[PDB]
Amino acid sequence: MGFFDRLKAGLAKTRERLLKAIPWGGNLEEVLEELEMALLAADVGLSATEEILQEVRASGRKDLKEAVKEKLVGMLEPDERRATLRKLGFNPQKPKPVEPKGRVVLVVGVNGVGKTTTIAKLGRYYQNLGKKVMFCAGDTFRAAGGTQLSEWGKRLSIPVIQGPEGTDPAALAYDAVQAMKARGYDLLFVDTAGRLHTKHNLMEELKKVKRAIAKADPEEPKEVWLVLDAVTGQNGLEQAKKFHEAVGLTGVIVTKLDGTAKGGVLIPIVRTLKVPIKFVGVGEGPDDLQPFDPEAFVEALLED
Ligand SMILES: Nc1nc2c(ncn2[C@@H]2O[C@H](COP(=O)(O)OP(=O)(O)NP(=O)(O)O)[C@@H](O)[C@H]2O)c(=O)[nH]1
């Protein structure tokens, strides 16, 4: 319960079509059939679905339902260690806290996916874990109404490195790291432009920003997080590929899970990018941005 409730609520649209209604009592032939449709309807994809079936049908010689759960969780965990600790019984009440590998987190993704809002929630999250957090408003470009990262910073008391619209994004991020160092901050999130059809090639700007961060601190950024909208589609995964090829993702944040019945998309995402989902977005609330936990996610896909 508690956050678990918020997760189940966020996955309700995906869950209540067929997943929860699966008749785990009938003769396999029916159940597995219903299972394949439920998966495909949730956007798990044919590839991962036919593998799940194999894993269960061929193998899966334990409890039918549990076999499914274990297989789905296995598909969501890119890290062998955690997969192992899980199999060994590790299953704490609430998911462990996501610790950035370093001090700088470069945030990327296409315009509109919710990068700005996601960073603000991340600031809160980390602040509540006692980190001194700083923001860099690397997307000086587009504002057009909405709420700037700049306004979010004042509200959380998080300083925002920013410059006049048009300011060199790379020089901003450089100043941002310098500032984070001199003032002794624990974490810096660098927001970035997300428009793929301007006169300035997005991927190239991005690489110039990551390079600037490195010039300031040769170890950074230790995290490159792509934000993906669960409502987009497979084009968004293709874009993901380009972002990965351009800057090397270390993680993925999936937002707007509450707005779709295709939440099963997380499986294809992790299988394609082979990086972990760090946080999942279950709504437009402050604490709606939660640390990802495969076990919990899978449970919410099937239960409640
Ligand atoms: N329902 C839902 N909405 C979300 C989630 N995350 C972000 N959003 C919403 O998505 C919209 C775009 O957010 P924003 O942070 O402005 O996006 P951007 O990707 O930063 N766009 P811009 O380039 O215009 O600054 C907002 O209305 C925001 O609340 C989520 O997990 N669920």
Swiss-Prot record:
GO terms for biological process: SRP-dependent cotranslational protein targeting to membrane. It catalyses: GTP + H2O = GDP + phosphate + H(+). Sensitive to endogenous proteolytic cleavage between residues 18 and 19 and between residues 86 and 87. GTP binds at residues 109-116, 191-195, 255-258. It is an enzyme of class 3 (hydrolase). The keyword Secreted does not apply. Its EC number is 3.6.5.4. It holds the Pfam family SRP54. One of its GO terms (molecular function) is signal recognition particle binding. It comes from the Bacteria. It is found in: Cell membrane; Cytoplasm. Keywords: Cell membrane, Cytoplasm, GTP-binding, Hydrolase, Membrane, Nucleotide-binding, Receptor. It is a peripheral membrane protein. One of its GO terms (cellular component) is plasma membrane. Belongs to the GTP-binding SRP family. FtsY subfamily. Involved in targeting and insertion of nascent membrane proteins into the cytoplasmic membrane. Acts as a receptor for the complex formed by the signal recognition particle (SRP) and the ribosome-nascent chain (RNC). This is Signal recognition particle receptor FtsY. It comes from Thermus aquaticus.
